[PDB]
Amino acid sequence: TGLSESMAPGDIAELGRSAELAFRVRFEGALPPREQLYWRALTMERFDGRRWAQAPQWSALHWQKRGPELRYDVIMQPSSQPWLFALDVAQTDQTDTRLMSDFHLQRRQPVEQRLFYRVSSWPQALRESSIDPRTRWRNLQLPMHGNPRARALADELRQAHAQPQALVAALLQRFNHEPFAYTLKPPATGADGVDDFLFDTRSGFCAHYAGAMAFVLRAAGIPARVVAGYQGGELNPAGNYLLVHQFDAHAWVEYWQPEQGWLSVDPTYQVAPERIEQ
Ligand code: EMC
Numbered sequence: 063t064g065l066s067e068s069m070a071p072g073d074i075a076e077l078g079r080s081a082e083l084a085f086r087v088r089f090e091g092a093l094p095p096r097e098q099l100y101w102r103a104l105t106m107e108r109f110d111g112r113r114w115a116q117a118p119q120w121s122a123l124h125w126q127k128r129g130p131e132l133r134y135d136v137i138m139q140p141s142s143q144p145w146l147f148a149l150d151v152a153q154t155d156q157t158d159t160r161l162m163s164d165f166h167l168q169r170r171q172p173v174e175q176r177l178f179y180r181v182s183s184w185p186q187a188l189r190e191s192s193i194d195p196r197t198r199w200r201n202l203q204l205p206m207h208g209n210p211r212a213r214a215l216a217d218e219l220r221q222a223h224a225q226p227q228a229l230v231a232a233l234l235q236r237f238n239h240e241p242f243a244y245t246l247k248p249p250a251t252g253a254d255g256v257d258d259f260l261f262d263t264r265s266g267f268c269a270h271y272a273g274a275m276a277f278v279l280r281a282a283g284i285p286a287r288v289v290a291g292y293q294g295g296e297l298n299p300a301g302n303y304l305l306v307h308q309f310d311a312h313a314w315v316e317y318w319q320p321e322q323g324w325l326s327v328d329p330t331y332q333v334a335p336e337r338i339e340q
Pocket residue numbers: 074075077078079246267268269309311312313
């Protein structure tokens with residue numbers, strides 16, 4: 063019926079089949095291009111071998127406004143969850159909502175009735191040029207056992223690429239140069255689900271790419287997490303608004319380094335750029 067605190071690919075696929083409305087958005091000025099419309103809901107910082115899940119957050123979070131400010135109104139359908147949707151980094155007019163330590167908005171109560179809120183976002187904000195130690199630590203967590211081939215790949219990438227930007231670029235280039243497939247009905251994978259996807263099936267959808275990428279970054283010593291939300295939306299020119307449906311559900315990645323802070327990346331773009339762009 064909506065996003066939840068945990069993500070396995072099957073949950074995202076189920077949202078992919080639903081035509082239910084998640085929210086509608088009206089921008090104060092021009093509509094941003096589709097590829098900037100990443101509606102962040104929550105982050106998933108725990109990986110247990112099988113799925114990515116939300117960890118506990120707290121509220122000072124170090125960030126700095128810079129670049130353009132986007133202003134828009136949202137009317138949200140009931141989700142039964144306490145997170146609000148918004149472009150990163152968001153501030154809202156809701157006095158019962160706070161920007162949490164993973165840059166997601168948490169409301170005091172779950173959204174059980176339609177809700178209107180106003181938002182200002184800074185998509186180019188500097189996020190944690192210095193990081194909270196709990197956050198850095200948490201975002202390097204992996205199970206000690208399982209997915210050994212992906213861990214081996216991470217070790218290789220770490221040796222060849224001392225700088226995180228270069229390592230991330232090489233991992234993205236693997237998705238782009240190897241013949242990975244983007245499909246909503248991929249082959250099943252086993253207990254080493256990261257290894258199976260990366261090396262054997264090489265076929266999946268946004269959740270596979272996001273999860274595997276965050277896994278390999280962590281195993282290479284770069285803090286990383288999965289971001290869950292929606293991307294894109296359908297324009298209704300008669301009302302000057304966008305509709306965002308459950309089928310717009312999407313997962314991506316962000317990774318941390320000193321000074322530059324958190325940077326977002328969508329590995330789906332390496333295999334299905336048309337889905338993101340159009
Ligand atoms: C619902 C396909 Hg990322």
